[PDB]
Write a protein that binds this ligand. Structure first.
Ligand code: GSH
Ligand code: GSH
Lengths: 496, 492
């Protein structure tokens, strides 16, 4: 994984890093330096990650099954409450207050917007060096998933090294190990993430789907009949992007949000939960339906797209929870709904491992057929609290069960897990555009994105009496982070 | 003209400065801070500048005459020398040393690389007052390190964002270039494309003239080490560049599209990195850098100001380049047409424009001659009295830079811009300066290489850029930190 950096130096390029910072700026792969304005480049790898056509294909093909698992589970509210009550009684001020909302909104008789937009990412890591997959699933996340916007840019940056290197080689010369991603045609090709286009369109199509549900034109016509006597309704609704009080990953959200505006013609406005305390008002128009959420007494909110609320600190006040509840209570298709949010919790990525009490019945409704395909990428997990055979699982061979605990420290004795040595390598990486760091024991984490928009279990809502309006692979990103501290963005070159 | 910032405030636009900064970074329209690595958006206007298709037409079509007029005067070495001698006597430590290179390389009978590559930009400004004249007057001719050929087309894309944004905002409550209607259309510059191709073709022309593979072969026959398979564009860069965006915007296309390598060096660097290797004493010597880089083109993004020549080392390096085979952009004789004196001499027609710069084509001279602000000559080699006698009939409209000029009242319009992270409204206080780029590649004055027996390999209009500025503002450009970039929108 140091071949690029080695070829560069040994082909007499000494000023490569300037260039690579310049290409970074062209594509707009950047981040604010701590001192005031003035953005500098993101941390990026000098080489892409290698991946079989087949293995890549498998990960892409399975995202719908993932999304579905999450939808099915998330909408199983009784299950969520029951299957998480102990984590709630433990973390009251966050995990608890989130479980309360599930209840007040979805589990009392109260009405609620049943459409939900998922923009998830499933993160796999490859197994080191059974018909199970080498790529084990290490992380599932449904809330403010990062890089769906930045990710494609990385491929264009890697295309640049490939070009530069081609000309540099020819210039000595020697194309003769070709590491064939450099010579674009066939055997190996840098695969551009489709997520910069698919995710803006999901958001787009969710706003559209909200408009059509509500008959927003008629909502206005009705609205106005009450004012035929203080603040008119906008003529289209908007995406409310909920941001943290200290916002980061900005380039990324713009790359997304700019496409929603320019390509799909829908306004995005940025709010903190705090700010919505005083901006957001619910407005009932039919008692038996979730209220319309106007912001500033004119913004109709079609989608509440969270780029926040995932960690406790974005809830520094009751007001913040008041505002967070207000949206959920509303009619905006949320991303994530609380249900979807609660499916990020590690406690459920564990539960999903139970392939017979949770995976098949709850998250696939008995389609053990489908369930069995996800299974391939599993790492067994095993709880520690009540159920008498939480001792038979501990009495079970050989120092291979997890910073984390493992080996001599774990031995001295939170949840059991099957130990997998993940594939590690050393990698050229470029930080701030001017420090080339040679990282060591660099893992690569491939994250395959999914977009889903679904209705109630059992509705007709989405065609072929589905209830799913759409469910699809949504591109990918790759993060290179050390096993054991900040990742670089990387990208896939697929070989067959 | 006011409209944009009023439409935003009115339509309830919100965080628009940040969105707009976002779009810049995303489009790669940026500028280095004075403090190291960080980059911030360029100053840009929140609306395009308007021009009629017919005037914009004539401006484009004039550019090849401009390139031609510059090519010829430049190549009339003895004329060029005589012209600048008083202006060199006044300033010996810059103009003098430059004029000395002309003397050395081109006049005293050495060999020199005869092929020359011009990346120019004639700027105009519309007067605000019959078609005996154009309404657009030429203000500066630029032949050394012309800026914005790379970034200009991004400015259209930025403005295109604003127009998209304003449609959506208008639509959202009830409800001109904002709409692509077709009777007013934002035209994106082609300078980002035509210029790289120009540098590409220049390398190609050098590669052919030298018959390089033939040359590379000889080298192995005649310590001297393995010489690269292909030459490079050498970009001679200022010691502390901020405008790296423009530079790379162009150069990356040379690499990625035209498969040709660029390398950046200061002069100071080149003094160590660059030696010359004579093959025949009748041809100018090859220039290799770092032992292996063959220099085919010496593009200069530096050298226009004295501050880039701190050391005699630096002038040395500059001569080495000049003496070399490399096609220069500019060559010294091109460089010297940037000077204010040549611009002032190109004014009188019978004496310099027709016989020098167009070789007795009065017709061509008469086209360019439609965009002139008459400059006359006080402190004269002639009697120079019958302009001074003329003036005090109608005395109220002639300034001087030393040299009597005619007093054009240049058009003032209204606009808003985003500079230094603030949104600036300029009410009836903004003048714009339309910059037509041009490229040229030519041989010796009577040679054959080039199209239809002419010494000219190519000569096109190369797109355009627009710069706007407060009218009450202090002298000069975007780099000076007083002007913003801008974009034309063309109206039938
Ligand atoms: N405020 C940031 C937060 C993004 C973030 O770092 N969140 C997590 C998901 S909850 C992520 O996918 N990136 C970090 C990681 O890989 O864990 C944003 O909206 O982009
Ligand atoms: N060294 C910088 C700046 C070169 C420069 O100052 N160019 C001048 C002409 S010599 C220009 O086009 N004017 C800057 C302006 O008008 O704002 C670069 O290569 O971009």
């Amino acid at each position: 994984g140091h071949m690029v950096l080695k070829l560069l130096l040994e082909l007499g390029a000494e000023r490569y890093a300037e260039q690579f910072a310049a290409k970074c700026h062209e594509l707009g792969m950047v981040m604010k330096e701590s001192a005031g304005p003035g953005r500098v480049p993101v941390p990026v790898t000098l080489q892409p990650s290698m991946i079989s056509r087949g293995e890549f294909g498998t990960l892409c093909c399975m995202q719908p099954l993932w999304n579905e698992a999450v939808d099915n589970t998330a909408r199983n509210f009784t299950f969520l409450r029951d299957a998480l009550q102990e984590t709630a009684a433990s973390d009251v001020n966050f995990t608890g207050k989130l479980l309360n909302m599930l209840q007040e909104v979805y589990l009392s008789g109260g009405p609620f917007q049943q459409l939900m937009l998922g923009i998830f990412r499933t993160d796999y890591m490859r197994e080191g060096v059974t018909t199970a997959s080498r790529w084990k699933n290490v992380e599932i996340n449904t809330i403010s998933c990062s890089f769906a916007g930045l990710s494609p840019l990385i491929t264009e940056f890697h295309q640049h090294i490939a070009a530069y290197l081609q000309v540099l080689q020819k210039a000595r010369g020697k194309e003769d190990e070709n590491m064939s991603w450099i010579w674009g045609k066939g055997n190996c090709r840098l695969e551009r993430s489709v997520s910069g286009d698919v995710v803006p369109k999901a958001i787009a199509d969710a706003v559209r789907a909200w408009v059509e549900q509500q008959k927003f034109a008629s909502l206005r016509a009705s609205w106005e009949q009450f004012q035929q006597n203080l603040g008119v309704l906008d003529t289209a609704p908007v995406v409310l992007v909920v941001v943290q009080e200290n916002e980061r990953n900005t380039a990324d959200q713009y790359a997304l949000l700019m496409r929603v505006l320019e390509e799909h013609r829908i306004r995005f406005i940025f709010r903190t939960l705090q700010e919505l305390h005083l901006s957001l008002k619910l407005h009932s128009i039919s008692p038996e339906q979730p209220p319309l959420a106007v912001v500033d007494g004119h913004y109709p909110i079609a989608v509440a797209y969270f780029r926040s609320t995932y960690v406790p600190e974005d809830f520094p006040t009751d007001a913040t929870w008041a505002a967070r509840l207000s949206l959920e209570r509303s009619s905006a298709i949320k991303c994530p709904s609380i249900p979807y949010h609660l499916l990020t919790f590690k406690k459920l990525q564990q539960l999903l491992c139970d392939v017979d009490r949770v995976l098949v019945p709850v998250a696939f409704c008995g389609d053990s057929d489908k369930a069995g395909l996800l299974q391939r990428h599993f790492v067994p997990q095993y709880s520690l609290n009540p159920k008498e055979v939480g001792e038979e699982a501990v009495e079970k061979d050989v120092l291979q069960r997890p910073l984390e605990g493992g080996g001599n420290l774990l031995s001295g004795e939170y949840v059991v897990m099957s130990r997998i040595q993940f594939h590690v390598s050393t990698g050229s990486l470029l930080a701030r555009g001017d420090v080339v760091q040679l990282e060591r024991n660099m893992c690569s984490e491939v994250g395959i994105f999914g977009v889903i928009l679904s209705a109630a279990k059992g509705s007709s809502v989405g065609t072929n009496g589905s209830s799913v309006l759409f469910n699809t692979f949504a591109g990918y990103t790759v993060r290179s982070k050390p096993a054991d501290g900040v990742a670089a963005l990387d990208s896939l070159a697929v070989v067959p």
